[PDB]
């Protein structure tokens, strides 16, 4: 029997999602199981559990981000620079690798999209506009980004069948941690400004490994190692959403744990 919206809403209530909550979901749809009306059933259940006063924040990114094509260069390669489409936040589809649910969240009516092409976030709720802006190049996940305002606004991380590597909010901990040898990257993004395509080159913290030992491909990063340690030492509400196992995590608490975790292991 495919899961109905109402069943999902009640499981989300059992897990601890309250009216008015600020929630960031990481969803594996395969672990959830079949839904009454496909992935939209889970989106509707999230909106309903969070209520008319709550908020959803999702890391959707961009399907056609020229990250690899421009990473390491002082300027976009000529072939890339002439033909690559500019980031249109109203029509650019989400990145499928971060979850198939994100394209349904971003096309939901009233959803707002942040301006960062590679680190794009989508928000639904009365505080959506406050969440998504500003989001500038050079502040992907660090202070002054949507994740920062999410952390200050009692955000909860809702992992539905996702692994510990999926906690996007922990990249904030990498940004602010006082440790030596933090890796940075340089890449270019095509932005749409006053109707016109403009290429912008910036540098930011390497979101694929803040230090060399976490940048390996094979290859657990700092985010996964922090999350595994956290989940082994912390009481966290656990339960099923659909057929997937889910955890509701206090975002400020795990980020705070991540800063101490990184700073205890690497001198300043």
Of 191, 223, 227, 244, which one interacts with ligand 9CS (CB under 6 A)?
223
Q: Which of 112, 123, 116, 130 is nearest to 87 (CA)?
A: 116
Of 188, 207, 241, 247, which one interacts with ligand 9CS (CB under 6 A)?
207
Residue 221 binds to ligand 9CS (criterion: CB under 6 A) = yes
Q: Closest distance between ligand 9CS and the C-beta of residue 118, in Å?
A: 5
Residue 165 binds to ligand 9CS (criterion: CB under 6 A) = yes
Ramachandran region, residue 246 (left: φ > 0; alpha: ψ -120 to 50; beta: rest)? beta
| Token duo for residue 76 | 């976009």
Distance from chain centroid for Cα 52: 22
Does residue 24 contact residue 157 with C-beta atoms inside 8 Å?
yes
User: Pick from ligand 9CS, Mg ion, none: which does 67 bind, CB < 5 to 8 A by kind?
Assistant: ligand 9CS
- Rounded-to-integer distance, Cα 266 and Cα 235, Å: 26
Site string for ligand 9CS, 125-164 (x = CB under 6 A): ----------------------------------------
DSSP secondary-structure letter at 3? B
H-only helix segments in 146-208: 146-151, 170-176
Phi, psi of 36 (to 5 degrees): -55, -45
Of 25, 89, 146, 209, which one interacts with ligand 9CS (CB under 6 A)?
209
Contacts with ligand 9CS in 59-118 (CB under 6 A)? Answer: 61, 65, 67-68, 118
Of 208, 236, 245, 266, which one interacts with ligand 9CS (CB under 6 A)?
208
| Token duo for residue 221 | 């990063």
Residue 48 binds to ligand 9CS (criterion: CB under 6 A) = no
- Under the rule (CB under 6 A), what is the footprint of ligand 9CS? 61, 65, 67-68, 118, 165, 207-209, 221, 223-224
């Amino acid at each position: 029997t495919p899961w109905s919206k109402s069943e999902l809403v009640r499981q989300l209530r059992d897990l601890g999602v309250r009216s008015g909550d600020m929630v960031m979901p990481h969803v594996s749809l395969r672990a959830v199981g079949p839904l009454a009306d496909g992935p939209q059933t889970l989106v509707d259940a999230l909106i309903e559990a969070v209520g008319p006063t709550g908020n959803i924040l999702a890391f959707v990114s961009w399907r056609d981000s020229p990250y690899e094509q421009t990473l390491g260069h002082d300027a976009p390669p000529a072939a890339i620079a002439q033909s690559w489409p500019a980031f249109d936040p109203d029509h650019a589809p989400a990145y499928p690798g971060f979850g198939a649910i994100n394209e349904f969240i971003r096309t939901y009516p009233g959803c707002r999209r942040s301006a960062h092409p590679d680190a794009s976030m989508a928000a639904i709720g009365p505080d959506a506009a406050w969440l998504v802006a500003p989001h500038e190049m050079g502040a992907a996940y660090g202070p002054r980004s949507p994740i920062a305002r999410f952390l200050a606004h009692a955000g909860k991380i809702l992992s539905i069948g996702a692994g510990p590597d999926a906690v996007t909010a922990l990249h904030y901990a990498e940004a602010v941690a006082r440790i030596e040898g933090k890796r940075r990257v340089t890449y270019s993004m095509p932005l749409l400004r006053e109707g016109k395509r403009v290429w912008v080159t910036t540098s930011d913290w390497d979101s694929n490994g803040i230090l060399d030992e976490y940048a390996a491909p094979d290859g657990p990063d700092a985010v996964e190692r922090i999350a595994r340690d956290y989940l082994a030492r912390t009481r966290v509400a656990q339960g099923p959403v659909g057929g997937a196992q889910s955890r509701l995590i206090d975002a400020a608490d795990i980020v705070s744990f991540g800063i101490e975790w990184l700073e205890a292991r690497h001198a300043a």
